């Protein structure tokens, strides 16, 4: 089970990871 | 599993890696 | 698997190198 | 496979060292 | 492939060597 | 239309970046 | 069009630039 | 055009870059 | 114009040199 | 013009190979 | 009394330090 | 007692250091 | 104590130490 | 103890030594 | 004990010593 | 008028600047 | 007036230099 | 007055390159 | 005054000088 929460979880985080940094770049531009 | 659990994340990781470059442009810019 | 796990991360690793320089030399300029 | 990512990688290392270099020079200049 | 890997990236780190040494130069000038 | 699409909103993205800049520096000060 | 898109948005990115750095300053003083 | 974007920029770049100098000697104090 | 857009440009970064090492100084003193 | 242009800037120059040597001093002092 | 003022209150500033940098990874994760 | 104040806290302090670390290393990567 | 307090936090901070050396090549990488 | 905190500590230090020198290469390369 | 942590360290070192030769190498090419 | 108003001001600022130094400690701590 | 207003402020600005050092101190240790 | 403006100032930079020495240590460590 | 300005000083920098060693020698153990 928990074996893959890792999984589940851990990939959202970096597509939210990826999100931010697009917001990121809205702002400086 | 965790084995491409790594493959999926991690290239995610890198994909923000460049955009956060990006900002980074942006602000020197 | 990984053994091009490596290929895909590594290489936009390099990507950003590029871009990161890119942005020093802005802040110099 | 791997023979080549270092094909590809590395030579993007050294496009990196060229625009360091180039970054180095503008403090300096 | 590897054979003029080394051609192709070889080169660039001469181009690298001028422009260092051209930095130097800017600094003791 | 697009195209300009950007024109518009990028430009007006700047504007903004100006006003947050003067808005940092009266807390600042 | 976007040729002076770029004219147009750069600049006014360097703008803030300064005030950035202005803003800076106050901090440290 | 683009010609004289890169002198209107470039030299503001530079402005800051004095700035930020001033603001690096300000923490050193 | 760009003849002379180094002159403009390229002198502000010496000057800024020159504040980088009064930093410095501060810094060692 | 630009036959000047090394006059002013290569001043400049020199003056701050003055001062980075006062730092180096400083260290070893 | 304040001796272990220092004792009680710095200890749990330190359990704090080690919960936010579990936070930052979260982020980065 | 503040002897083993530094004890307890300074520990914790390193925990930290590794953990901080680690998270670099996600941003990094 | 305090002579296993260094044993404590001393290996502690080398096992970072490694940590942010793998960082580092990550960045270069 | 301490004897043997060298032991410990010290080895972790070279360990390191490496992997720096391996970052370093990188950046070169 | 230490009689083997000089065998331990001592070799560690000289296989950065090599590496870091490698890397001079890659600066001069 | 203005000359003391720095005199005023810039002292404040001053003042400041170490009530943030003792939070960023306090941080860290 | 102003010949010591450098005076007073100058001196506090070295004043948070040390705390700042304190600061980084606590985040290594 | 700035006389000793200097001695009182120069001495405080004095003490923090003591103290930040003592963090680089805490770092390499 | 100025003369023994020099002397609190100048000792503290060589302290400086000695720890500044010490830190270069755990790098390279």
Known sequence: ???ILEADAEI???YARILEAHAEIL???
């Open 12 to 14: 959202l985080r970096a």
């Open 1 to 3: 089970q928990a074996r």
């Open 27 to 29: 702002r400086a531009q």
